[PDB]
Design a protein around this ligand. Structure first.
Ligand SMILES: C[N+](C)(C)CCOP(=O)(O)Oc1ccc([N+](=O)[O-])cc1
Lengths: 112, 109
């Protein structure tokens, strides 16, 4: 059994930034990809980025500048980061394992 | 830019065979686009159904099956249940990103 888990920070203020952590488990972080998908409250799913099992990471073009996916192999965590927080960023954020899929609970992130 | 299309919603009934279909704006969906199929349950529960255009995710029930049909991909349920009532999502790998469809609302009556 696989298991991912979105351990992020409660609300967040406009202008300030956020940071979320994916604690994967049940497998090696170099053997697959991990994506950060996010869904605005009452809205479509949206990809923000991915981080190859090798370390390469691609980014949703329009959200290039604010992100940063990365991961600590030993800690078994994958980390994601936006900057310049605004209202339309209040969404639930999830990390998905490649080759599955295998989704994470998510974790609502508000923005006040 | 690449827009993915799914049927907004579809109605069925128990024991029936249903087909949801993820298409592309650029052109025919292929094996290159690695079609992913995810089910959204209430309280926001995503569960992987179909992987690699057609690989049953090690968990999805045998009644879920993926494949390409024409210039598009498709998820079919063969003998649907009440509990299959949810919104299904599909993503399309366009080489370096992932594009999500708008979801299909499937009412099981
Ligand atoms: C395009 N890429 C490489 C960036 C992501 C592909 O991952 P996937 O093919 O969607 O997941 C997969 C891959 C393979 C199997 N299988 O049964 O061999 C199933 C699901």
């Amino acid at each position: 059994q696989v298991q991912l888990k979105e351990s992020g920070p409660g609300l967040v203020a406009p202008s300030q930034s956020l940071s979320i952590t994916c604690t994967v488990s049940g497998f090696s972080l170099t053997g697959y990809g991990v994506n950060w998908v996010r869904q605005p409250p009452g809205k479509g799913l949206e990809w923000l980025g991915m981080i190859w099992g090798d370390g390469s990471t691609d980014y949703n073009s329009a959200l290039k500048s604010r992100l940063n996916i990365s991961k600590d192999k030993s800690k078994s965590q994958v980390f994601l980061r936006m900057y310049s927080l605004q209202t339309d960023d209040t969404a639930r954020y999830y990390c998905a394992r490649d080759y599955g899929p295998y989704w994470g609970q998510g974790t609502l992130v508000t923005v006040s | 830019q690449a827009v993915v299309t799914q049927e907004s919603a579809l109605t069925t009934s128990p024991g029936e065979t249903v087909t949801l279909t993820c298409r592309s704006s650029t052109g025919a969906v292929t094996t290159s686009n690695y079609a992913n199929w995810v089910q959204e349950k209430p309280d926001h529960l995503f569960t992987g159904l179909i992987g690699g255009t057609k690989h049953r995710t090690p968990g999805a029930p045998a009644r879920f099956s993926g494949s390409l049909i024409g210039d598009k991909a498709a998820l079919t349920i063969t003998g649907a249940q009440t509990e299959d009532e949810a919104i299904y999502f599909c993503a399309l790998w366009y080489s370096n990103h992932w594009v999500f469809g708008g979801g299909t609302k499937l009412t099981v009556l």
